[PDB]
DNA sequence: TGAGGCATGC
């Protein structure tokens, strides 16, 4: 995968500019641009989503579309300052399809081989940022760091620690904010509450 | 429109 394209540097601007050159999997070809993380190395909370969506791929920034707006409300309800956040995605290029007779770009879940190929960028970000806690937003991100057998619905809101992760941060898994939109509106407010609770667990981690 | 975890299809 991407490991040869990751330069030996902790400068997020250099990593981001290099990601524009990555050939670690096929996603780079149909996407507009790599969407790297956003934030500074002084962040103590890192949050990892699945992939850039349609709006993210057009803007070049993580979490700018509907799921990111919901994440924004979740952050405010958990009293998490954005000054403490570095936010990124497990996969750096937008994976999508279109209906043959349609124009809208329809997001497709990254394959597990794409997550594995792209994980060197995530490791590079984690070493550069040295977060005290990593929030895994959804199954793709959580499995990226915790193994393909990990079930976010089974262990969300738990403070976890694994050995093979650089810097031994606390890890907190939760559901991706888009799941609240995809699921029934009847469950949406309860689901938002659950997200906010998990985020509160993550913000109260003390190294 | 914007998951999750299991199942089936080739
Ligand atoms: S997705 Fe990750 S690994 Fe695949 S190309 Fe874009 S950057 Fe390289």
Reported structure resolution in angstroms: 2.1
C-alpha A88/C-alpha A58 separation (Å) is: 16
| Burial class of residue A180, CB neighbours in 10 A (0-12, 13-18, 19+) | buried
Positions in chain B where some atom is under 7 Å from a protein CB = 1-6
Burial call A96-119: b when 16+ CB within 10 Å, e when fewer = beeeeeeeebebeebeeebbbbbb
Contact in structure between A118 and A1 (CB atoms under 8 Å): yes
User: Given phi > 0 = left and psi -120 to 50 = alpha, else beta, which region is A59?
Assistant: alpha
Burial call A54-69: b when 16+ CB within 10 Å, e when fewer = bbbbbbbbbbbbebbe
Tokens describing residue A120: 């060197």
| A52 CA → ligand 1 middle, Å | 12
C-alpha A16/C-alpha A13 separation (Å) is: 5
Work out if A89's Cβ lies within 7 angstroms of strand B. no
Q: Is the CB of A201 under 6 A from ligand 1?
A: no
Interior angle at CA A128, CA A205 and CA A6, nearest 5: 135
| A200 CA → ligand 1 middle, Å | 31
Burial call A166-175: b when 16+ CB within 10 Å, e when fewer = eeebbbbbbb
| A176 CA → ligand 1 middle, Å | 20
Name the experimental technique: X-ray
C-alpha distance from residue A31 to each of A28, A87, A96, A130 (Å): 5, 20, 8, 29
Work out if A53's Cβ lies within 7 angstroms of strand B. yes
To which residue do tokens 């403490």 refer? Answer: A84
């Amino acid at each position: 995968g991407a490991q040869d394209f990751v330069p030996h540097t902790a400068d997020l601007a250099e990593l981001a500019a290099a990601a524009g050159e990555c050939r670690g999997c096929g996603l780079y070809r149909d996407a507009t641009q790599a969407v790297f993380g956003a934030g500074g190395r002084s962040a103590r909370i890192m949050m990892i989503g699945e992939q850039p969506g349609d709006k993210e791929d057009l803007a070049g920034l993580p979490f700018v579309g509907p799921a990111g707006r919901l994440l924004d409300r979740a952050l405010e309800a958990a009293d998490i300052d954005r000054d403490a956040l570095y936010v990124t995605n497990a996969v750096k290029h937008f994976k999508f399809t279109r209906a043959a007779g349609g124009k809208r770009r329809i997001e497709k879940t990254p394959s597990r081989t794409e997550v594995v190929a792209c994980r060197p960028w995530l490791i590079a970000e984690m070493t550069s940022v040295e977060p005290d806690v990593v929030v895994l937003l959804g199954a793709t991100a959580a499995k990226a760091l915790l193994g393909n057998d990990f079930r976010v619905t089974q262990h969300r809101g738990e403070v976890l620690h694994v050995d093979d992760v650089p810097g031994d941060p606390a890890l907190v898994a939760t559901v991706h904010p888009s799941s609240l939109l995809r699921g029934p509106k009847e469950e949406r407010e309860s689901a938002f509450a659950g997200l906010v609770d998990d985020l509160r667990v993550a913000a109260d981690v003390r190294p």
